[PDB]
Amino acid sequence: MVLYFIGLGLYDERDITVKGLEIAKKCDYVFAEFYTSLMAGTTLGRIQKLIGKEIRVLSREDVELNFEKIVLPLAKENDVAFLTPGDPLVATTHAELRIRAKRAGVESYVIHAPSIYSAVGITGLHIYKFGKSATVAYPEGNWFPTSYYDVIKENAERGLHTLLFLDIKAEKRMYMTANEAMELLLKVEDMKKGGVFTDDTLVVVLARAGSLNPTIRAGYVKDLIREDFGDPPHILIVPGKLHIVEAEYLVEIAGAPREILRVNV
Amino acid sequence: MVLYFIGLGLYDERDITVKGLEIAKKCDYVFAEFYTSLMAGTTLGRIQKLIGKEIRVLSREDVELNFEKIVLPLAKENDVAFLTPGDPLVATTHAELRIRAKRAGVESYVIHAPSIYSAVGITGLHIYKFGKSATVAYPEGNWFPTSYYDVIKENAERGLHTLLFLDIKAEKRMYMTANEAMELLLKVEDMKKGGVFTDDTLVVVLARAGSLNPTIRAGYVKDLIREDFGDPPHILIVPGKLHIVEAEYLVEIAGAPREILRVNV
Ligand SMILES: Nc1ncnc2c1ncn2[C@@H]1O[C@H](CSCC[C@H](N)C(=O)O)[C@@H](O)[C@H]1O
């Protein structure tokens, strides 16, 4: 009778909310997609074991083109769940699927889960200070995406931090590292020369949020661009002007150069 | 020797993650704070029964002034949990507590949970389009703060959405309603005349996010200002120019008038 969109969280199968788990366990059919993000600390098997249900994984094509043919038909006479990494409606286009559900006469409900969008709070940067977000996409052929550079410029001008989601090519098992994102940004900088992203720019890297020991590092691009931040997923952040407490946390917790403690007010 | 910052999530006792629950259950001591926000869909008793541990609630003073006197001494020789509504470290004052832990020679780990910051994705508005966030504070005496109005102005002129956290008197457990926020914003507009918030402004109200039955409503201030959005908590969003997909979700899912499809896109 219903369709549930349930987030699985940041890193492993235990990042699902108790609410989401109890609801999933009682659903008749369970579908899921693992192309919008990477849960580096679990496997399909462990997720299936926790929920006690077989999980039918769908590809991007299955979802975007055939969601109404694969999932919705069952939701008309059964309780169906659609699982996704992190929060199902953050930096995905899954919200549109609720419209398809409605038009198909299917009621849908959303169960949230920890998202990287809010988890960056662990970097010590004030969440309210984050401005517009952007995605660093892999260049393809003659096409080299650069909109994310303008976003950083716009936020920085306002003293706001910029969250940069990094690209993912699930089927090819490609996960953009913070290092690759920094390299692309330097290239865009040489092209636009806006002084937005250089070797002297302070950046923050958060890798495998959700795990108990995520990698949290802050420093200048010149020093971090070749640093090993561990396995993906990674997210890159370009902070705006720092408040004293933000700088203190980056130094004490993220190993940033003590010199950033001296904010230029 | 270990302190766990564990998020309780959005609304009720089941919004904690499985990871958070299992870790909390094994902790020797469990503390909690309910001053950064509240858990409107549950009670201390229900949270205690779920975790199966006595929970010592701490006031803002207990934490800000005495975190190292009350919590850290126990964390030095035991496993201690510190529960917070939402996702830990979204609240600005949380981060610094990890530095206190470090100074006391205590290891700390963060267990994330859903935050309203990311849960607003259920409004159908693209997460990347949210700019700087702000809090609408109740005016009192001769004090009439209005910085949140400027935040909306700066975001909107850049085509970005503005997430407005509404004031809460945690201690007294009194919540500002979206209606009161709209009244205040109209009040501020009449004083600043910036043309930022008027009867013709399109707003989105999200009430009781996390619940299976949150109220999601979109429409013009003139129509929503006296509407009943149900019990707290309420969140108010002033969207910037909309992508057609965002507008269609607001119409189909949030009952927005068809007019937004031609006026706000
Ligand atoms: N645990 C994690 N650690 C670091 N980055 C993460 C992450 N989970 C997701 N990301 C980042 O976000 C991108 C996916 S965007 C989809 C996000 C998801 N709906 C959520 O709510 O988190 C990844 O390519 C990566 O850059």
Are the C-beta atoms of residues A51 and A21 closer than 8 Å to each other? yes
Mention every residue, 6+ apart, whose C-beta is less than 8 A from residue B147.
Answer: B134
Q: Are residues B27 and B104 in the same domain?
A: yes
Residue A87 Cβ inside 6 Å of ligand 1? The answer reads yes
C-alpha pair distances (Å), A210 with each of A213, B132, B248: 8, 24, 33
Statement to judge: residues A57 and A177 lie in one domain? no
Number of domains forming the structure of chain A: 2
Cα-based distances in Å from B84 to B30, B167, B203: 11, 17, 29
Domain check: are B148 and B231 in the same one?
yes
Same domain, B206 and B260: yes
* Å from CA of B117 to ligand 1 middle: 15
Q: Are B15 and B37 in contact (CB under 8 A)?
A: no
Q: Among B36, B126, B132, B160, which would you mutate to test the A interface (most chain A Cβ atoms within 10 Å of its Cβ)?
A: B132
Report CB contact under 8 Å: A17, B15.
yes
Is residue B121 domain-shared with residue B101, that is, in the same domain?
Answer: no
Distance CA B48, CA B35 (A): 18
Give yes or no: residues A130 and A261 share one domain: yes
Collect all residues of chain B within an 8 Å Cβ-Cβ radius of residue A14: 17-19, 22
The response to whether A30 counts as a known ligand-binding position is: no
Residue A99 and residue A133 in one domain: no
Chain A partners within 8 Å of B100 (Cβ): none
> B84: domain CATH number?
3.40.1010.10
What CATH number does residue A217 fall under? 3.30.950.10
- A132 and B129: CB-CB below 8 Å? yes
Domain limit, last residue, from A79, A114, A149: A114
Enumerate the residues of chain A whose CB falls inside 8 A of the CB of residue B164: none
Fill in the DSSP letter of residue A214: -
- Residue A69 token pair: 């043919």
Does A163 carry a binding-site annotation?
A: no
- Cβ atoms within 10 Å, residue A172: 8
Burial pattern A66-83, b for ≥16 Cβ within 10 A else e, equals: ebeeebbeebeeebbbbb
Q: Name the maximum alpha-carbon separation found in chain B.
A: 63
> Do A230 and A162 fall into the same domain?
yes
- Asked if A124 contacts A249 with a C-beta cutoff of 8 angstroms, the reply is yes
Residue A135 sits in the same domain as residue A207: yes
Q: Are residues A205 and A80 in the same domain?
A: no
A and B: number of Cβ contacts within 8 A: 173
- Among the listed residues A30, A61, A26, the one whose alpha carbon sits nearest the alpha carbon of residue A44: A30
Domain finish residue from B82, B98, B114: B114
Residues B260 and B198 in one domain: yes
**By CA distance, what is B110's nearest residue in A?**
A212
The Cβ of residue A41 has, within 10 Å, a number of other Cβ atoms equal to: 18
Domain that holds residue A102: 1-114
B123 in the same domain as B110: no
Of the candidates A70, A67, A87, which has an alpha carbon nearest to the alpha carbon of residue A20?
A87
Q: Would the annotation count A234 as a binding residue?
A: yes
Choose the final residue of a domain: B63, B92, B114: B114
Instruction: Please name which of A96, A74, A91, A90 lies closest in space to residue A30, comparing C-alpha atoms.
Output: A74
Pairing of β A2-7 and β A107-111: parallel
Pocket flag, ligand 1, residue A33 (CB < 6 Å) = no
Report CA torsion sign: A205, A208, A209, A214: negative
Tokens of A152: 């950083």
Method: X-ray
